[PDB]
């Protein structure tokens, strides 16, 4: 009698449902029941089975309450018969491995899906015991009809509960969160120290961190349908990142992902269909499958849909090379045109010292946590050295400044910056004043208020901290803004250790450029995007063309206008480009026959140099020991601020002598040997660079970086350290800007 029931819920494509439970002896089967319980559009369970696990007098109450207790002590969502059925009773679905079949099948009730089963499953296979040949063809049997429904858009919305993954690789990295709030099952449960992808509760900001339970902005725009229900996405994304940082030397592919998506029910089918779209988003954005990883020939990191386009890259530095290796891996045509007769740009190592690599340019990694440079070091098996915190301030000549005098003046200097941060509050760009002009004004305005009188030693030790600040801005504080001198710290910066990349950045650079079509000695002089596609013309005349174009030239070269743009850049960009400063420092390295400083230095990775006057304050302020093993004996020092101008007419012999004049002051108690080898950078005069790293000019704003990074008509793109607002100046920034633009270029 009374045969058919139906479904209670709105929109269900099933009026005569079948039960999957098969629990109760009195299972209503396809027959009639008091009420159907909706799990999806292909999964309902009757009320007789509902009672089997729910009613204290039935034969399942013991399994349900055992699970219920565990669910309430590990999870945050409410335990329900519907949650139990979806986490324990639903049959797993597995897709056949046969390349020619690939049909989705339901496994028997008591079968527990494992990654090993999903890897080697074939139609009609019994995971019980091992492959003994059979005379029956299970791969021609019609695929269950509910499998096609699954990929209809509406299907997900009508899923009552979210998919909670079992045994996710991210489980260990998310033990601080309730499992079910990050897309994992409450009934569940040797990485590189520098890999910490997941925000931890109560943690402050640290760069390149994702929230395990919140979709970032670009994720909302890329997948809008997940702004109402984000659970499945967050589950798969945290798994992808968990897999990537678990093995960052291999290209992560949909194939090796699937065996780790473990969830009962048809929803799994939807998961493996989506993990592929999510995995390609992560790749285009550069969250995974990035770094020094090389792909070829053959196995391009994106579907051929992204492949049919050509782009030209101007400048083969960290930026242009980062984007090059990326667009190359995606499967896109890439031709990069460099000006100099070498690659690397502001990355230029000198491997001519004995048992030591010294960098004419970049060589320090500022904060290693989540830094792409640390990842690219894992991928290259390279190791780094962590700077000690000890830096003694040696005067002229020999005396190591008294700690009490040192701390004293560090406090006061930092205080001077506290009040600079106060004054600047609410001022506009028009009310901007040179940082240095403000610190002086505040400095005297304080000596006035109190008869406190600084000694010539205290006053000089303060100068060292002004030069130190000029060393980071690569400019005299009188040209650097007071409002925006640290604009970027408004955002989350790279935490962790500051290190010295011992092998040198050149390593990571040469590995990125490996196999790329890099035309050297091909300075670009004109760029015409007024036609159908872009036309890049070199200084000798050689013509190139491509659909897109990515300029990554140094800031200084954009202000000089070296490249003719047709049409020209917007008056706004020109203002944004010119409102930033082209910072500059120069380095100097000296090799000696023996370590003469070990006696007073005592291991310190460096030593400071207290300026005699405020004019010679940028002249070799800090001296770095370029051997973390303390074996060989090289020294590297820096010229910054006003001092880089007092040295632009001199030759190297002169610079050497001014550097030796100071070493022998700093070390008066001893004979300091003569440098058997040395070099004195000339980044100022290098025609295609003309700078060290950018800063914000008085009256400017960090918004300028974003304006520069604006693409034009979705054709011309920009990158470089002067286009990464969050992280300016650094190789890291220049690198991430490359990746960023690779993403933009691949979408269009």
């Amino acid at each position: 009698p009374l045969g058919s029931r139906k479904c209670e819920k709105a929109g269900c494509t099933a009026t005569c449902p079948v039960c999957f439970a098969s629990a109760s002896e009195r299972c209503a089967k396809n027959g009639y029941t008091s009420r159907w319980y909706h799990l999806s559009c292909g999964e309902h369970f009757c009320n007789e089975c509902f009672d089997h696990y729910y009613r204290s007098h039935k034969d399942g109450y013991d399994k349900y309450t055992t699970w219920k207790k565990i669910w309430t002590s590990n999870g945050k969502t409410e335990p329900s018969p519907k949650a139990f059925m979806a986490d324990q009773q639903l049959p797993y679905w597995v897709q056949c491995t046969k390349p020619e079949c690939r049909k989705w099948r339901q496994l028997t009730k008591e079968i527990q899906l494992t990654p090993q089963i999903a890897k080697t499953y074939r139609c009609g296979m019994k995971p019980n015991t091992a492959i003994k040949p059979e005379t029956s063809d299970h791969c021609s049997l019609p695929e269950d009809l509910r499998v096609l429904e699954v990929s209809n858009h509406w299907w997900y919305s009508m899923l009552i509960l979210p998919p909670l993954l079992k045994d996710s690789v991210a489980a260990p990295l998310l033990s601080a969160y309730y499992p079910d709030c990050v897309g994992m099952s409450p009934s569940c449960t040797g990485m590189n120290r520098y890999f910490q992808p997941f925000y931890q509760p109560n943690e402050c900001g640290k760069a390149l961190c994702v929230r395990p339970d919140v979709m970032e902005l670009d994720e909302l725009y890329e997948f809008p349908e997940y702004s109402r229900d984000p659970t499945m996405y967050l589950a798969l994304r945290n798994l992808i990142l968990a897999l990537w940082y678990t093995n960052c030397k291999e290209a992560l592919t949909p194939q090796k992902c699937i065996p780790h998506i473990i969830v009962r029910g048809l929803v799994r089918i939807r998961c493996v269909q989506e993990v592929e779209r999510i995995l390609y988003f992560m790749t285009r954005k550069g969250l995974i499958n990035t770094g020094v990883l090389s792909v070829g020939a053959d196995q391009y990191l994106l579907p051929k849909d992204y492949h049919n386009k050509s782009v030209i890259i101007i400048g083969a530095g960290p930026a242009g090379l980062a984007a090059a290796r990326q667009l190359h891996n995606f499967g896109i045509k890439v031709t990069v045109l460099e000006a100099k007769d070498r690659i690397g740009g502001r990355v230029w190592d000198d491997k001519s010292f004995k048992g030591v690599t010294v960098g004419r340019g970049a060589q320090i990694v500022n904060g290693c946590i989540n830094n792409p440079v640390a990842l690219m070091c894992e991928q290259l098996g390279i190791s780094m050295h962590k700077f000690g915190e000890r830096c003694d301030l040696i005067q002229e000549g020999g005396r190591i400044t008294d700690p009490t005098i040192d701390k004293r003046m560090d406090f006061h200097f930092n205080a001077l910056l506290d009040v600079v941060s106060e004054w600047r509050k609410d001022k506009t760009q028009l009310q901007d004043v040179p940082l240095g002009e403000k610190i002086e004004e505040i400095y005297k305005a304080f000596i006035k208020e109190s008869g406190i009188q600084f000694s010539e030693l205290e006053g000089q030790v303060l100068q060292f901290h002004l030069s130190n600040l000029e060393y980071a801005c690569g400019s005299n504080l009188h040209q650097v803004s007071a409002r925006s001198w640290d604009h970027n710290e408004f955002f989350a910066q790279f935490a962790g250790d500051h290190t010295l990349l011992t092998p040198g950045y050149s390593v990571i650079i040469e590995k990125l450029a490996e196999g790329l079509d890099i035309q050297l000695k091909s300075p670009v002089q004109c760029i015409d995007y007024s036609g159908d596609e872009v036309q890049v013309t070199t200084t000798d005349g050689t013509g190139y063309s491509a659909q897109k174009v990515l300029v990554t030239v140094p800031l200084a070269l954009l202000q000089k206008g070296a490249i003719q743009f047709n049409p020209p850049l917007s008056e706004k960009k020109m203002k944004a480009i010119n409102s930033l400063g082209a910072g500059i420092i120069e380095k100097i390295a000296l090799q000696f026959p023996y370590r003469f400083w070990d006696s007073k230095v005592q291991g310190a990775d460096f030593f400071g140099h207290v300026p005699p006057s405020a004019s010679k304050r940028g002249l070799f302020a800090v001296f770095y020991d370029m051997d973390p093993q303390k074996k060989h004996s090289v020294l590297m020092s820096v010229i910054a601020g006003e001092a880089v101008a007092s040295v632009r007419t001199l030759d190297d012999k002169q610079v050497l002598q001014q550097c030796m004049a100071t070493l022998r002051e700093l070390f008066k108690e001893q004979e300091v040997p003569d440098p058997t080898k040395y070099f004195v950078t000339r980044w100022s005069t290098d025609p295609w660079i003309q700078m060290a790293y950018s800063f914000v000019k008085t009256g400017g704003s960090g918004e300028a970086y974003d304006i520069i990074a604006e693409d034009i008509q979705g054709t011309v793109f920009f990158a470089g350290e002067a286009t990464n607002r969050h992280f300016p100046q650094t190789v890291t920034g220049a690198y991430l800007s490359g990746v960023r633009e690779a993403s933009k270029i691949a979408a269009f």
Partner: peptide, 26 residues
């Protein structure tokens, strides 16, 4: 930018540290 400083980092002038109050918190 302060961020480029390695040896001897200046600490004054920083904006107040801030924290994301997640609800998936324990």
């Amino acid at each position: 930018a302060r961020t480029m400083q390695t040896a001897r980092k200046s600490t004054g002038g920083k904006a107040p540290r801030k924290q994301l109050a997640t609800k998936a918190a324990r």
